[PDB]
Amino acid sequence: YVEFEPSDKHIKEYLNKIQNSLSTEWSPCSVTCGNGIQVRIKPGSANKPKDELDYANDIEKKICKMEKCPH
């Protein structure tokens, strides 16, 4: 059945997009309406080089729900 959860592919594409503002603060939501993702660098991973961040272990993720998308 349809998953209705964000995929890791979407999340990885979002990470490329905001790579220059990515930090230990929660990012903006990846969409402006509907469901997206927010990401941040894990607390105890702030010391790691940017090119050595493990997707699963060094990046935190959460779902964000924005206002409904208009027509």
Token digits of residue 37:
């993702």
Alpha carbon distance, N-terminus to C-terminus of the chain: 26
Q: How far apart are CA 29 and CA 71, in angstroms?
A: 20
Number of domains in the chain: 1
Count Cα neighbours of 71 within 13 Å in the Cβ-side half-sphere: 0
For residue 46, which amino acid is it? A
**Does residue 61 contact residue 71 with C-beta atoms inside 8 Å?**
no
Range of the domain at 29: 1-71
Token digits of residue 5:
């959860």
Q: If DSSP codes are grouped into helix, strand and coil, which group holds residue 66?
A: coil
- CB-based contacts of 6: which residues, under 8 Å, 6+ apart? 30, 35, 36, 37, 63
The secondary element (H helix, E strand) that includes residue 56 is: helix 55-58
CB atoms within 10 A of CB 28: 13
Q: How far apart are CA 44 and CA 28, in angstroms?
A: 21
What single string gives the DSSP state of each residue in 7-20?
A: -HHHHHHHHHHTTT
CATH number at 25 reads 2.20.100.10
